């Protein structure tokens, strides 16, 4: 009986809100079950709760501008509802019949199963971390303004995807023509297969934190005849973006030797690293700049490192950074840093040539890349490999490993390689190595001074400094 549905809607309308117009939804409410009506709208009334039973018939629910936490069981047949701009902390089951979801502008963390009939789904503007599983005939899925950081597979059906202002770290997957609003994500690189997507798909990648290097080169091969993708296109600011006054105490260092080209450098290892936040990476720069400020001599030596590697090597900030560490350790060296701790500078030699083999499987990986930067690919190995091969000094990204191309056989390859390729190398690597020198000069320039006169191609350099090593090695047993 509809009496039985008055009578509980007339109990609901005495427990409204003084703000809430409760009386008008119950007008609303009757005219719809009296009348059989399909569509029901209950939009504007400052509505705190909906009544627990709603007309079974309709087909259509509006329930938009309220202050709906939750809703009630929905009715069997509903294709179509409208609950956007409430408070929804969470959704009733869906009756398999939806079409239409439109839950814009709610608090929902999560979203219910999603039944097989959809076509539309628009949550945007809530806090979802997750999608479910996509119904195989959704067409458009518009997701903006929340927190995810991956997407399902997209089913064949969709014709349109907006993941605008979310946390993604990579492209979606692609599953009539094609469109993915990506804009304001954390994509910091596209696959290279992307440019041979066909020409009725388009991507929107503007704002996002892609390198100019990787942004120039789509620039680059878009115009060139002949998928349509939009996108974006000194000297004391380069030094304190990286805190936290030490901006004032690097302004007296403005005016020396290759200090344009030291800002070149950090502002393009920026470029590549911003995004992670966490790293990680930004604490061990800063501290590593405290160094060179309180120093004259690696402040001077670190600018040349710098301007040495600008002629080709603007690509591999990688192998430049790691070079910028080697002059610290140089540096440290000099100073006695390591005696008696022959077996320490041994063991940080075994890490330093391992991070330096992971180095060369990066660039050669990236040579022939245009769309991800070298760093991408090398602290993705250096996350995922720093354990198996122990690297403590190891930059541990928690985010962004999930790069393109990279596979899990990449992964093990290279432990593999760094394994052999040290079980070949280290011992000549080691007796060439910089650091090495520098306690050598330092503490025993006995044998040094005698086997630089021994020196009477880089082959004999080799030979001399192999029979060097080996001999002191000996000494600390």
Not at 13 to 24: F, M, T
Request: aromatic share 8%; charged share 25%; proline share 5%.
């Amino acid at each position: 009986t509809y009496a039985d549905y008055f009578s509980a809607w007339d109990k609901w309308e005495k427990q409204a809100l003084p703000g809430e117009n409760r009386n008008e939804a119950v007008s609303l409410l009757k005219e719809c079950l009296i009348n059989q009506f399909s569509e029901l709208q209950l939009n504007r009334l400052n509505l705190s709760s909906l009544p627990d039973n709603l007309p079974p018939q309709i087909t259509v629910l509006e329930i938009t501008q309220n202050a709906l936490i939750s809703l009630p069981e929905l009715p069997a047949s509903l294709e179509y509802l409208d609950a956007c701009d409430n408070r929804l902390s969470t959704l009733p089951e869906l009756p398999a019949s939806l079409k239409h979801l439109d839950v814009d502008n709610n608090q929902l963390t999560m979203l219910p199963e999603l039944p097989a009939l959809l076509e539309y789904i628009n949550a945007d503007n809530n806090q979802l971390t997750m999608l479910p599983e996509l119904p195989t005939s959704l067409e458009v899925l518009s997701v903006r303004n929340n927190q995810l950081t991956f997407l399902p597979e997209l089913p064949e059906s969709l014709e349109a995807l907006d993941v605008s202002t979310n946390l993604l770290e990579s492209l979606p997957a692609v599953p009539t023509e094609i469109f993915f609003r990506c804009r304001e994500n954390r994509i910091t690189h596209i696959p290279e297969n992307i440019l041979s997507l066909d020409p009725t798909c388009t991507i929107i990648l503007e704002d996002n934190p892609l390198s100019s290097r990787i942004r120039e080169s789509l620039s680059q091969q878009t115009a060139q005849p002949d998928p349509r993708i939009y996108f974006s296109m000194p000297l004391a600011d380069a030094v304190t973006a990286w805190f936290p006054d030490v901006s004032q105490i690097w302004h007296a260092f403005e005016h020396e030797e290759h200090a344009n080209t030291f800002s070149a450098f950090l502002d393009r290892l920026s470029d590549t690293v911003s995004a992670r936040n966490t790293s990680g990476f930004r604490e061990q720069v800063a501290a590593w700049l405290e160094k060179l400020s309180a120093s004259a001599e690696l402040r001077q030596q670190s600018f040349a490192v710098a301007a040495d590697a600008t002629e080709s090597c603007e690509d591999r900030v990688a192998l430049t950074w790691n070079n910028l560490r080697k002059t610290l350790l140089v540096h440290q060296a000099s100073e006695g840093l390591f005696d008696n701790d022959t077996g320490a500078l041994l063991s940080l030699g075994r890490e330093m040539f391992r991070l330096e083999i992971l180095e060369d499987i990066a660039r050669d990986k990236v040579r022939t890349l245009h769309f991800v930067d070298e760093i991408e690919v090398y602290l993705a190995f250096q996350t995922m490999l720093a354990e198996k091969l122990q690297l403590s000094t190891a930059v541990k990204e928690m985010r962004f490993y999930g790069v393109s191309g990279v596979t899990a056989n990449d992964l093990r390859t290279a432990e593999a390689m760094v394994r052999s390729r040290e079980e070949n190398e280290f011992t000549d690597w080691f007796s060439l190595w910089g650091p090495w020198h520098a306690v050598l000069k330092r503490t025993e320039a006995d044998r040094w001074a005698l086997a630089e006169e021994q020196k009477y191609m880089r082959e004999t350099e080799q030979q001399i400094y192999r029979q060097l090593t080996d001999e002191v090695l000996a000494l600390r047993l």
